[PDB]
Structure formats: C-alpha cells, structure tokens
C-alpha cells in the first residue's frame, strides 16, 4: 500500500553506496507468539518476529510442565484471530 | 488478516520447544529496489528484499555518474507507487 519512507543513499563513494529506507507501521506485517505455564494465566511471555521467520524455539522452560502458546498475525492496527497450542515439556 | 497457519509444536525437550508455522504468500510484504545510471538506456539491477531488511549496499558503480534509485513495496499481488532518489557517485 505505502511506498517505503525516509530513503537516503549514504556513503556514496566513487564505486559504491548504501541505500537506506524505512517502512511505516501501516505495512509492518508481524508475528506475535505468546507462551507460558497454561494454568498461571498471568505468566505470558511475548515474542515478536518478522513475517519471514517460520519457526521459533522457546528455551529456559520448566521440566514436566504444561505450556500454552498463542500465535497471531499483526499489521498496523489489525490482528488475526489467535491460533493456540498447548504442549507439556 | 489471516492467522499463521499449520502451527505445530515439534522437538519438545525438558526445557525447550520448537513452534512452527507458515503464512500464505498473499500476505508477505517486501521491497523491490531498482537502481541504474539515471538517464541511459538498459542495464538496471533489481533486488527484492524482505520487509525485514531496512538497507542494502551496492557496488560496481561508475566513478562519477548519476544514478537513480527506485523503491516499491509489495504485498502479494499489490504494489505501491515508487519512491525515487537520484544521486551522483
């Protein structure tokens, strides 16, 4: 929808140059992944990830515990309906 | 907005899990950068990057030449009007 914003060539030498830009929040299409012990609802950790990530690895988990993990898409001020999983370490 | 799809918990250990998902192509967003000697016919290098990369670095330009640079956003089959910047090496 929106063109990239800012936009600056920097370090322009004789044979080289760096092109720089931004992207608005408008089209910043993102993944959020929340996770925590399932029956402690207040314990939720959020990870935001680039649209291009297709996986993530949660660490520092407690042995023998059941976890819930919730997964949404986010673009600007629209979010998807959540997608929930539950697993037990 | 479409949620993440598939979605599996894989490789559960006593302290780690792996979450996996994918998104439909429809929803991916990148930048298409095109650059070349401003006013000369032909050439051009065109690069497509993911929304993750805010910068890109270019090389093998001619020592004291004007270039023009064009950046479009892409989300699916839609694109933006371009944003364009000339510069002289």
Swiss-Prot record, chains A, B:
Tissue note: Detected in fibroblasts (at protein level).
UniProt domain Fibronectin type-III: residue ranges: 3-89
Compartment(s) of residence: Secreted, Extracellular space, Extracellular matrix
Annotated transmembrane regions: none
Function of the molecule: Extracellular matrix protein implicated in guidance of migrating neurons as well as axons during development, synaptic plasticity as well as neuronal regeneration. Promotes neurite outgrowth from cortical neurons grown on a monolayer of astrocytes. Ligand for integrins alpha-8/beta-1, alpha-9/beta-1, alpha-V/beta-3 and alpha-V/beta-6. In tumors, stimulates angiogenesis by elongation, migration and sprouting of endothelial cells.
Involvement in disorder: Deafness, autosomal dominant, 56: A form of non-syndromic sensorineural hearing loss. Sensorineural deafness results from damage to the neural receptors of the inner ear, the nerve pathways to the brain, or the area of the brain that receives sound information. DFNA56 is characterized by progressive hearing impairment with postlingual onset.
Assigned protein family: Belongs to the tenascin family.
Assembly behavior: Homohexamer; disulfide-linked. A homotrimer may be formed in the triple coiled-coil region and may be stabilized by disulfide rings at both ends. Two of such half-hexabrachions may be disulfide linked within the central globule. Interacts with CSPG4. Interacts (via the 3rd fibronectin type-III domain) with integrin ITGA9:ITGB1.
Protein name as it appears in the record: Tenascin
Protein's organism: Homo sapiens
Protein's gene: TNC
